[PDB]
Amino acid sequence: LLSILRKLKSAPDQEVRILLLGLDNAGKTTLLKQLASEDISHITPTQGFNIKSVQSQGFKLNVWDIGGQRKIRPYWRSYFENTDILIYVIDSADRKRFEETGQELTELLEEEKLSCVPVLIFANKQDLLTAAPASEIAEGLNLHTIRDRVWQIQSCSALTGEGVQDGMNWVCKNVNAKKKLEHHH
Amino acid sequence: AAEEEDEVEWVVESIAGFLRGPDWSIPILDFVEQKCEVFDDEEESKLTYTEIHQEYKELVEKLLESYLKEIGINEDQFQEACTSPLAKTRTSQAILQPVLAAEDFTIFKAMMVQKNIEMQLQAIRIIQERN
Ligand SMILES: Nc1nc2c(ncn2[C@@H]2O[C@H](COP(=O)(O)OP(=O)(O)NP(=O)(O)O)[C@@H](O)[C@H]2O)c(=O)[nH]1
Ligand SMILES: [Mg+2]
């Protein structure tokens, strides 16, 4: 059986699978590359997905950055299984798409294959003078109503890097949150 | 317990033998050759890679299941063998590669990208020679 095979890994307990989701243009690939200390200046729309592994605070974070275009979103569920942490990225300055992203987030958090998964919401592009505050986005999403999981909202700018690590610090304290909750269940 | 761990050691060596042999290795190689064509040596992955990884997972589960059943090794024994440090030291990185590739997509992708590089090169050498 396939799940037994993880026992043949070098250090399988140090490995964290992170799913990075959000609308097209939200700044996901830009965030991913910042995390991996890579150049962010030649980034184009993602037609499939990227993976980058980042060593941080005693863990190997395997980060799956899936393309956000609408035509790609039906494939999102191909990536739900064996997710340890969900990071959801919002363009804080694209108010016209708040409803669209609110609806994607709501659907993700009702998804059976993401049950018990901790969610970090990155309120991105805070460098922009047009950016709504995280407090506003939290309210607008009704994040306080989130049940059956831990969650966090973090103001950030993938472009400048500001606020990014603070979000990742929360992620690292919650590497076992999903399996601790599903053991409770 | 000591005798019980010797039996685990047998199970580890049996698994190692299987992973070295043609019953495992040849269906894996056929799959890799037949499906590697769309794997480009590029950072960004295509959505189809995932669909193909899923078939790979199915093949691996099928091969392992047949093995475990023809030989008569139950799942619990299989798990305690894969959990034993003997599993790492009695197998090699090369033998483990297509096994790890079942759970580790990054390993699967590098394996397919490498086979496509090789087969494209061979296709190029042939074109080179026919003139
Ligand atoms: N000002 C500003 N621009 C940003 C920030 N993060 C990303 N961007 C810009 O927003 C655009 C989209 O970025 P990108 O990372 O490609 O978004 P994406 O979520 O990966 N898109 P897709 O899902 O289609 O692949 C790029 O021009 C990028 O430079 C940020 O924090 N501030
Ligand atoms: Mg992208």
Author numbering:
A (entry chain A): 3 to 187
B (entry chain C): 2 to 132
According to the publication:
The ciliary protein Arl3 has been shown to act as a specific release factor for myristoylated and farnesylated ciliary cargo molecules by binding to the effectors Unc119 and PDE6δ. Here we describe a newly identified Arl3 binding partner, CCDC104/CFAP36. Biochemical and structural analyses reveal that the protein contains a BART-like domain and is called BARTL1.
Here, we demonstrate by X-ray structure determination that BARTL1 binds Arl3∙GppNHp in a similar fashion to BART complexing Arl2∙GTP (Zhang et al., 2009). The asymmetric unit contained two Arl3∙GppNHp and two BARTL1133 molecules. BARTL1133 displays the same all-helical fold as seen in BART (Zhang et al., 2009). As expected for an effector of small G proteins, BARTL1 is in contact with the switch regions of Arl3 (area 2). In addition, BARTL1 completely buries the N-terminal helix of Arl3 (area 1). This unconventional binding mode sets it apart from effectors such as PDE6δ or Unc119 and from many other effectors of the Ras superfamily proteins. The hydrophobic side of the N-terminal amphipathic helix of Arl3 is buried in a hydrophobic groove formed by helices α3, α4, α4′, and α5 of BARTL1. Leu3A, Leu4A, Ile6A, Leu7A, and Leu10A are submerged in a hydrophobic patch made up by Lys58B, Val61B, Leu65B, and Leu69B on α3, Phe79B and Cys83B on α4, Ala88B on α4′, and Leu97B, Val100B, and Leu101B on α5 (BARTL1 [B] and Arl3 [A]; Figures 4A area 1, and 4B). The second interface area is formed by switch I, switch II, and residues of the interswitch toggle of Arl3, and on the BARTL1133 side by the loop connecting α2 and α3 as well as parts of the α3 and α6 helices (area 2). There are polar interactions between Thr51B and Tyr81A, switch I main-chain nitrogens of Gln49A and Gly50A with Glu45B and Glu44B of the α2-α3 loop with Lys45A of β2 in the interswitch toggle and Lys35A in the α1 helix.
